[PDB]
Amino acid sequence: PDNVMMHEKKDGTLMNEFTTPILQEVMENSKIMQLGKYEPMEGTEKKFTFWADKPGAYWVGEGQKIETSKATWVNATMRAFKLGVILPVTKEFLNYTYSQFFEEMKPMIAEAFYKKFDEAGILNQGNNPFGKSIAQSIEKTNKVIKGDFTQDNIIDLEALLEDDELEANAFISKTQNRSLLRKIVDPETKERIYDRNSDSLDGLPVVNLKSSNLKRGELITGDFDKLIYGIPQLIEYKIDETAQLSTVKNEDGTPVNLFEQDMVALRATMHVALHIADDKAFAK
Amino acid sequence: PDNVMMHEKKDGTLMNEFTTPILQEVMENSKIMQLGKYEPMEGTEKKFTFWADKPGAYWVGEGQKIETSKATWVNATMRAFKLGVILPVTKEFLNYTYSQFFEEMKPMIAEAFYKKFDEAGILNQGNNPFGKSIAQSIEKTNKVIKGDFTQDNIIDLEALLEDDELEANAFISKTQNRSLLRKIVDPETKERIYDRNSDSLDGLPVVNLKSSNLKRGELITGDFDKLIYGIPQLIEYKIDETAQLSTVKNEDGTPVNLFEQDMVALRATMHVALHIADDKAFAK
Amino acid sequence: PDNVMMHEKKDGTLMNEFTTPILQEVMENSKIMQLGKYEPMEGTEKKFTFWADKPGAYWVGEGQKIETSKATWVNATMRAFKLGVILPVTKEFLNYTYSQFFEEMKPMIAEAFYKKFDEAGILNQGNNPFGKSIAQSIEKTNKVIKGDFTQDNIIDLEALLEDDELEANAFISKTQNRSLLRKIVDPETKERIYDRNSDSLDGLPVVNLKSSNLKRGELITGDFDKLIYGIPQLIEYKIDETAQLSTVKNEDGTPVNLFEQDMVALRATMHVALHIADDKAFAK
Amino acid sequence: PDNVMMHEKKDGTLMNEFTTPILQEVMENSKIMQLGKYEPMEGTEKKFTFWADKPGAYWVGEGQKIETSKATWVNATMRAFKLGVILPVTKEFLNYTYSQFFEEMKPMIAEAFYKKFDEAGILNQGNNPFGKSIAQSIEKTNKVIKGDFTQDNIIDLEALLEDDELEANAFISKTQNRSLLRKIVDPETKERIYDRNSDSLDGLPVVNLKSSNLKRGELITGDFDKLIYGIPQLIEYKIDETAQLSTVKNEDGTPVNLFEQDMVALRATMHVALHIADDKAFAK
Amino acid sequence: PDNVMMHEKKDGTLMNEFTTPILQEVMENSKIMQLGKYEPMEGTEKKFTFWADKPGAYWVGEGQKIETSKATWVNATMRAFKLGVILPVTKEFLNYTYSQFFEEMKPMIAEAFYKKFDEAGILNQGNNPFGKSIAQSIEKTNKVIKGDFTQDNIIDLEALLEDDELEANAFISKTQNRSLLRKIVDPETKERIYDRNSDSLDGLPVVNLKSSNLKRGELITGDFDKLIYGIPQLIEYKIDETAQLSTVKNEDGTPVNLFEQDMVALRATMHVALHIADDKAFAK
Amino acid sequence: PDNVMMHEKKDGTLMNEFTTPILQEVMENSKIMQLGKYEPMEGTEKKFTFWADKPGAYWVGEGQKIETSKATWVNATMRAFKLGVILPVTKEFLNYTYSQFFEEMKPMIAEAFYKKFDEAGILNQGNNPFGKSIAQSIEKTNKVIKGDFTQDNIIDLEALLEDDELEANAFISKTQNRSLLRKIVDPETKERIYDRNSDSLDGLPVVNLKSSNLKRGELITGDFDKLIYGIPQLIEYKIDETAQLSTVKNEDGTPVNLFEQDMVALRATMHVALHIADDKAFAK
Amino acid sequence: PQNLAEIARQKRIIKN
Amino acid sequence: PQNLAEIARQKRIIKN
Amino acid sequence: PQNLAEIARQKRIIKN
Amino acid sequence: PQNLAEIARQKRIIKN
Amino acid sequence: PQNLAEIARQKRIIKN
Amino acid sequence: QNLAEIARQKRIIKN
């Protein structure tokens, strides 16, 4: 029914023509999406990990391997406030039409979705964890290295991960950490590890995690599952927002302050093969 | 109604047919313009910043945070003059008509706008201030680097932007400063930093500010919002001036000294998200 | 005969409409396929070589040349668990058989299968060799240099097969090895060998091997025939395996642990010219 | 009226159909239209310059800038003997008419005109200059460098224009200097600078002025204003000239020896911004 | 007579339709072909040469020319074996339809033809060179220089061929030689001689002679005459061939060892006009 | 009248369709033709020379323009007897046609004509002079340099003609000289004069005269007048030739020695300005 | 206004 | 969800 | 088989 | 004059 | 033969 | 005419 034409619909369910564009804008910004692997889901589901192989009838022995099961779920709320200011009333939505409202929000809602998933996915910082983060797997299996940035330590980190079979892949390190990666040079073999032009640490690519969680550290992965799908939805109302903060004092009374907010309900889900390592600071 | 035909219109708003040409020439010439992203506004616009911490039907008491509001205004007017003094009286322009005058005036007016805009907008010197500016934001947060042109200092400069989880995008170096930039080569990795052909410092485009408010300086930008509204709007002038100076000491008495000037009041607005770096010479 | 309408086809042979698409996906995935040719055949192919010499008419003085025949064969298999985990969704297959079934699983079975080929192709770690090519070709014709990374050594690496009347085509070097390729610069002629934009060593494209079986090595190729034949051949049983473990250790009793498994039996074949250069490392 | 048909009209003024072709030869041959600029003029135009202040209705400002007024004048002549070479008026001129005339001395007359423009334009050795010239601007504003053709000296030369907020565009240097341009081997980076195939120094096109007044040096140019106007005049008279030589010893009189002369006087003016650089050797 | 349709012709002559394709594949692969110039002939070619001098209507001094005539003939012949075996006996003939085999076997015979001819053309190997080879012309006029590969030594070779009024056109050097030249750099100016990307030595294009009759040898020619006039022919052989040998060291009886053999004869002629340069190794 | 038909025309004033291609081959091959300005005429021409100086419009005259009267004549003959031998009998001519002879004739007769002219044009060794030759001008205007090849000498050589007003324009030399031009390098300023890639001596372009007369010579050439108008003609007969010495020492009577001869006579002219320099060896 | 923003993205130094 | 997973595989930093 | 041959020739890193 | 302007801008070494 | 001479002119290492 | 045109077009010194 809905397309362009009009917009005087406060509540509803978002049409899939505009949904997958919104998810397409979340796509690149989320670091765990780039590093992870994707297999399709509808609400609740179970999958099995790893890869299988044979050499035919020639050689029966060798090539032993493991299978493991896990169930996928959990919901993540999104409450918007910027929207309320840029558009006074719902007749203005109508004047734009149904299409352009979501095109205006296309960056805004997408920015906050990837921001929270990465904060609650790579670490357990926010209030939207559920299973086990990358940090949580490292809390189980003591894979800690002391705060020193040398060619031996990066090779040791990869070797430590390699020691339990699985080979290393892309790196997660914050933007401030990029400055320390510049000056890692050996005297005998005069070559720098970190390539400045193409963002890659030891050949493998890096992602600059825009968050205030890490300080001086490096993370790696390879084998990780992270596909999510349902429907975002839209609910427009004016109430006392609990998890937001007006100006700098107290909770935002919307009928008092005169805004028109919007909600997006998306689902968030993660499955991990539990063997990852972290490098952290020592101080003294 | 008016197009070619004639030219006896003293006062008048320019049509959008001619507004895009004049602004097109302003876009390339101005340095701040080239770097910024221009969302549309009217007289004013209210923009909000920040995100929020959002869980799904659980919520623990943390991550309330701050939300910030901001609005923008103030204009940027400039004079044509040049055409007026070269080509005198209306009957002389009657042959040229409406279409001919704008094309011939095109580079003079466009050259004028950016010179004044950048002299007050980037460096806060020219007498047309509006709070929000590049040089003013550096007074709040000290991003100062000393006067030496080596790769490590440019790395350290970019590292200061990285400290507050922000990426480098472009550069601003003076035309006079272009000599010192090119003669910087590392001993180990024997490659030139500043490329002469493709104007870029660290694979990031440098833009040459013609204003004389710099010596040995480098400015950096990325997320930046300039805005524009309405029309250039022209008025023919045969009256006395206070702002301009006639060679020696007397003023531009247009009916006294037989000239025929032009007035062009353009409306341009600026907004800054903050965290912008700058290198300056120290010497002693 | 076969259509989209209906499923419940457990044991069967694929149509050429779907066999070519699934192969197309496996071609770009592979390393040996990207650096190799394709002669057609049915079961086994008889090949032969050499050019010979012949007189015009008279003398026939000192004319003596030889020629020899060759052979090619061998089959490879894989046992996927992933389609058996999907198997619960009977409505999927019943509603849209083949088209939607094989499209969903193009990575699921080809991704594992191509890595098995590369294990026995470029290395000999896999237990499905036939010609036992690259590893043994180095052992047969000792064309190895003591591993240090300089242009002189890269020229020497190419010189080994250039000496035996064979032109260099393309390189095989790790993603981790990419970092050491940047420091290659000669003292007299200040020019770079490796280009940042395109993964190529010289006028010669590089393929990055993901299988962790190289330290600091480079391999030249360009005289190989990779040959895929027959049909993938799908079987769908729900019974106990031999080469498998179910989570703890015990054999995956598929009736108890209610899954299914899809079998894929494609054909895999190679052939050699026995003139390849290999590099490794000096002391450590 | 005139086109082909006949030739007889001795005096007159050229048609625009035969003005543009002969003038095109001047432009392409000369080292000024190739490296300069153009506008139309009517007899002796007047130019006005410099940027005004203009406030934005807030405060008038304490900058206070000035306005500069300028002009251009003077024309050149040429009386060639080439028509005396092609004299035969009875037969040839009737067949040649008003079309083939100009085609036979399309290279000549234009040849003599283009050479003299650069002779009294780039240098000031001629006896028909009109003040504004490159050599004179260098005498006014000292930009003279004394040294060999080293990379740093070429950068220094260019930097003089950059020092007064002006960008370099192209180069003027003779073919004899090309030998010394070849040996510019840098200590770092690309070891070349000057491109051998395409005649360009720093990616800026070098123009080969083949004058007798240039020893071994480079001039930079990129801010000219050349102004051609008026269709050229032609005259046909067989007469005695005051100056000039008949053969070897004596004055050229027509009744003595039957020659025939052709005059072409093209009116042309110049202008400069008064900031152009020069390089020469060190006197020792 | 023939077209598509059928195939039961054991002996035969090729049509012009099929003759020029196989000859086209000979052209690009040959070294003497590309370097040398061409003309059509019949059975044999006789070309008459030399220059004269005369003023006209006068007799003066001396300097009368001399006459010399040159006739060229003979043929280089190349056998298959390989090509007959590919076709399955008379069954191919039963379903061939006079098209696909000349196309399938296009590069197999063409490769061997150039292989044998180049050995006879450039070197004096085999009993095929009835005329004078390049090596033989070097023995007549001693233009052999001894020394290691250095810039000046390569120019010295060209200088000596230039010494007798003849400009150097292009080099001939094998695949082993190509790899050796790369390390040659000029001391005075930091620039390289040999280029791999554009295969040329001293700005002169090179072709790799892939034969085992050269070590450190380079050859340059200006003029060269080669003739290819005739037809390839098509013959079957079920009987034994002396030139061909089986794997070990035996004559290979074709009735004994069930093979099929093809035989092709190309009427090719070669000729030189003396004065060719050469290089060779010293050892001791 | 003629076009193709079937030749049989022994005598013949050949048409301009086939003349201008044959002359074009003489032009490109000739070295004197590559450098000069060539006015047209029929049998003989009285014509004037030297470029016209500027009048100057406002300033009386200054430097005198200078004018001089000259004359032009003389014919050159050439017999391509071996080219006539190629076609044995009049029946063979019938199949060859009028048109075929000219295209196949074009290379040899053009070769002979340019070789004759340059030998009796630059030097005065060949005996078809017109007085005004380069060698004869050097005898009058004494411009001889001793056997020394250095940068200082080449500058001094150009300075000799510079002393008498004129500018050095271009060089004429042989291919043997290229070796001797390579060794010229100054130790203080390490740079070669002669460029190997682009054939230019001191920046000025060189042309290679392949004549066995000079040895260690550099010739300098500027403005030259010549004429190649006139129909070459084509006569062929079966008669004795006193010019063409056959085999050992005889007239070569055509009834005795059955051949066919062809004679072509092309009008040719040369003129000088009597200011040309020349270098020569001395030894002792 | 909207056309100016469209032109801006086309005529930017870095197109995005 | 299938079209999302297809584009997700396409736009990934690590090559499959 | 036939399509395979053409794609193996086309869809490849090295091409002549 | 007007045609000259077009030719001057077109027939130039720098920027066409 | 004649076609070969034409292709020898076209398809060649050197062109004049 | 045509011969003079070819000479002008194919003179090496075209400065």
Helix (H, G, I), strand (E, B) or coil at B95: helix
Please name the residues in contact with E48: beta carbons below 8 A apart, sequence gap of 6 or more: E69, E70, F82, F83, F85, F86
d(CA F277, CA F161): 7
d(CA A82, CA B48): 5
Bridge-based pairing state of the strands A224-225 and A218-220: unpaired
CA distance C102 to chain H (A): 13
How many residues can be counted in chain H? 16
Query: Quick check: D266 and D228 in contact, CB under 8 A?
Result: yes
Closest among A62, A38, A222 to C119, alpha carbons compared:
A62
Nearest CB to J14; choose among D205, D228, D229? D205
d(CA A23, CA A120): 18
How many residues can be counted in chain C? 284
Q: Chain E contacts of D192, Cβ < 8 Å?
A: 191
Query: Quick check: D77 and D263 in contact, CB under 8 A?
Result: yes
Q: Chain E contacts of F124, Cβ < 8 Å?
A: none
For residue A160, what is the enclosing H or E element? helix A151-162
Letter string b/e over residues B248-282, b meaning 16 or more CB atoms within 10 A of that residue's CB: eeeebebeeeebbbbbbbbbbbbbbeebbbbbbee
Dihedral sign from CA coordinates of A103, A107, A109, A114: positive
Q: Which residue has the tokens 């193996």?
A: I8
Q: Which residue has the tokens 């037809």?
A: E231
Query: Quick check: A266 and A228 in contact, CB under 8 A?
Result: yes
> Within 13 A of H13's CA, how many CA atoms are on the CB side?
25
Closest among C170, C161, C159, C157 to C202, alpha carbons compared:
C170
d(CA A230, CA A75): 10
- DSSP-derived secondary structure letter, D224: B
- DSSP-derived secondary structure letter, L1: -
Q: Which residue has the tokens 């040999």?
A: E194
Please name the residues in contact with C279: beta carbons below 8 A apart, sequence gap of 6 or more: C144, C145, C147, C153, C157, C216, C217, C218, C219
Query: Quick check: A96 and A7 in contact, CB under 8 A?
Result: yes
d(CA E219, CA E279): 7
- Integer-rounded Cα Rg, in Å, for chain A is 23
Helix (H, G, I), strand (E, B) or coil at B111: helix
Cβ neighbours around A60 below 10 Å, total: 12
Q: Given phi > 0 = left and psi -120 to 50 = alpha, else beta, which region is A204?
A: beta
CB contact under 8 A, C54 and E75: no
Closest among B25, B1, B12, B9 to B97, alpha carbons compared:
B9
Joined tokens for residue B270: 């600026």
Helix (H, G, I), strand (E, B) or coil at B237: strand
Q: Which residue has the tokens 């006639």?
A: B246
Bridge-based pairing state of the strands C278-279 and C144-145: parallel
d(CA F268, CA A224): 88
Closest among C193, C194, C22, C202 to C112, alpha carbons compared:
C22
Please name the residues in contact with A36: beta carbons below 8 A apart, sequence gap of 6 or more: A221, A224, A225, A226
Q: Is C183 an 8 Å CB contact of chain B?
A: yes
Q: What is the 3-state secondary structure (H, E, C) of chain E?
A: CCCCCCCCCCCECCCHHHHHHHHHHHHHHCHHHHHCEECCCCCCEEEEECCCCCCCCCCCCCCCCCCEEEEECCCEEEECCHHHHHCCHHHHHHHCCCCHHHHHCHHHHHHHHHHHHHHHHCCCCCCCCCCCCHHHHHHHCCCEEECCCCHHHHHHHHHHHHHCCCCCCEEECCHHHHHHHCCCECCCCCCECCECCCCECCCCEEECCCCCCCCCCCEEECCCEEEECCCCCEEEECCCCCCCCECCCECCCCCCCCCCEEEEEECEEEECCCCCEEEECCCC
> Within 13 A of B218's CA, how many CA atoms are on the CB side?
31
Helix (H, G, I), strand (E, B) or coil at D138: helix
Q: Is F182 an 8 Å CB contact of chain D?
A: no
Closest among A137, A202, A126 to A164, alpha carbons compared:
A137
Instruction: Find residue C204's DSSP bridge partners.
Output: C202
DSSP notation for chain C:
---SS-----SB---HHHHHHHHHHHHHH-STTTT-B----SS----B-------SSS--TT------B-----B--EEESHHHHHTT-HHHHHHSTTHHHHHHTHHHHHHHHHHHHHHHHTSS-SS--SS-HHHHHHHHS--EE----SHHHHHHHHHHHHHTT----EEE--TGGGGTTTT-B-SSS--BSS-SSS-EEESEEEE---SS--SS--EEE---B-B--S---EEEE-S--SS-EETTSS---TTTTT--EEEE--B-B----S---EE--S--
d(CA C241, CA C244): 6
Closest among C25, C45, C224 to C122, alpha carbons compared:
C224
Shortest CA distance from L12: residue in chain F? F34
Q: What is the 3-state secondary structure (H, E, C) of F22-77?
A: HHHHHHHHCCCCCCCCCCCCCCCEEEEECCCCCCCCCCCCCCCCCCEEEEECCEEE
Bridge-based pairing state of the strands A250-253 and A240-246: antiparallel
In angstroms, the Cα distances linking E5 to B27, D37, E83, E271 are 71, 72, 21, 42
In angstroms, the Cα distances linking D245 to A157, D79, D248 are 93, 13, 7
Resolution of this PDB entry, in A? 3.8
d(CA C176, CA C193): 17
Cβ neighbours around E282 below 10 Å, total: 8
d(CA C218, CA F98): 66
Helix (H, G, I), strand (E, B) or coil at B37: coil
Please name the residues in contact with E51: beta carbons below 8 A apart, sequence gap of 6 or more: E65, F111, F112, F115
d(CA K4, CA E227): 10
Chains within contact range of chain G (3+ C-beta pairs < 8 Å):
B
Q: Chain F contacts of E49, Cβ < 8 Å?
A: 82
Dihedral sign from CA coordinates of C208, C212, C218, C224: negative
How many residues can be counted in chain A? 284
d(CA F143, CA F276): 7
Query: Quick check: F221 and F276 in contact, CB under 8 A?
Result: yes
- DSSP-derived secondary structure letter, A220: E
d(CA F37, CA F224): 6
Dihedral sign from CA coordinates of D40, D42, D47, D53: negative
Query: Quick check: E175 and C168 in contact, CB under 8 A?
Result: no
Closest among C270, C276, C227 to C131, alpha carbons compared:
C270
Backbone torsions φ then ψ of A282, nearest 5 degrees: -115, -35
d(CA D246, CA D240): 10
Q: Which residue has the tokens 């000294």?
A: B257
Cβ neighbours around A198 below 10 Å, total: 11
Instruction: Find residue E71's DSSP bridge partners.
Output: E46
DSSP notation for D179-221:
HHHHT---SSTTS--SBTTTTBSSSSBEE----SS--S--EEE
In angstroms, the Cα distances linking F37 to F121, F271, H5, L12 are 16, 11, 75, 11
In angstroms, the Cα distances linking B128 to A141, B41, B209, B210, D61 are 62, 20, 18, 18, 8
Q: Is H3 an 8 Å CB contact of chain A?
A: yes
Q: Is D183 an 8 Å CB contact of chain E?
A: yes
Backbone torsions φ then ψ of B72, nearest 5 degrees: -135, 145
CB contact under 8 A, A205 and H14: yes
Closest among C232, C231, C230, C237 to C262, alpha carbons compared:
C237
Class of residue A70 by CB neighbours under 10 A (exposed 0-12, middle 13-18, buried 19+): middle
Closest among E101, E84, E106 to E239, alpha carbons compared:
E84
The angle subtended at Cα F149 by Cα F148 and Cα F155, nearest 5°, is 105
Query: Quick check: E233 and E266 in contact, CB under 8 A?
Result: no
d(CA F140, CA F135): 9
Q: What is the 3-state secondary structure (H, E, C) of E257-278?
A: CCCCEEEEEECEEEECCCCCEE
For residue D19, what is the enclosing H or E element? helix D16-29
Q: Chain B contacts of A116, Cβ < 8 Å?
A: 51, 53-54
Q: Chain D contacts of F57, Cβ < 8 Å?
A: 74-77, 128, 265
Chains within contact range of chain D (3+ C-beta pairs < 8 Å):
B, C, E, F, J, L
The angle subtended at Cα A45 by Cα A40 and Cα A47, nearest 5°, is 75
The approach used to solve this structure was: cryo-EM
Shortest CA distance from C187: residue in chain B? B190
Helix (H, G, I), strand (E, B) or coil at A283: coil
The angle subtended at Cα E164 by Cα E158 and Cα E168, nearest 5°, is 30
Q: Which of A113, A114, A127, A263 to probe the B interface (max B CBs under 10 A)? A: A127
CB contact under 8 A, I4 and C23: yes
DSSP notation for B146-214:
-S---HHHHHHHHHHHHHTT----EEEEETTTHHHHHS-B-SSS--BSSBTTTTBSSSSBEEEE-SSS-
Shortest CA distance from F54: residue in chain D? D78
Letter string b/e over residues K1-16, b meaning 16 or more CB atoms within 10 A of that residue's CB: beebbebbeeebbeee
Joined tokens for residue F27: 């032009």
Which amino acid belongs to residue B27? M
Backbone torsions φ then ψ of F144, nearest 5 degrees: -110, 135
CA distance H9 to chain C (A): 10
d(CA E15, CA E4): 12
In angstroms, the Cα distances linking C240 to B244, C8, C243, E106 are 96, 21, 10, 54
Chain D interface residues (partner L, CB cutoff 8 A): 107, 175, 208, 210
Instruction: Find residue A278's DSSP bridge partners.
Output: A144, A219
Cβ neighbours around C21 below 10 Å, total: 13
In angstroms, the Cα distances linking C7 to C93, C106, C266 are 6, 18, 22
Q: Which residue has the tokens 């400065």?
A: L15
- DSSP-derived secondary structure letter, A189: S
For residue A257, what is the enclosing H or E element? helix A254-257
Class of residue E139 by CB neighbours under 10 A (exposed 0-12, middle 13-18, buried 19+): middle
Joined tokens for residue I7: 């794609």
d(CA G12, CA A190): 40
Crossing angle of helices G2-10 and B16-29, in 10° steps, is 30
d(CA A105, CA A113): 12
Backbone torsions φ then ψ of C36, nearest 5 degrees: 180, 165
Query: Quick check: A63 and C243 in contact, CB under 8 A?
Result: yes
> Within 13 A of B216's CA, how many CA atoms are on the CB side?
13
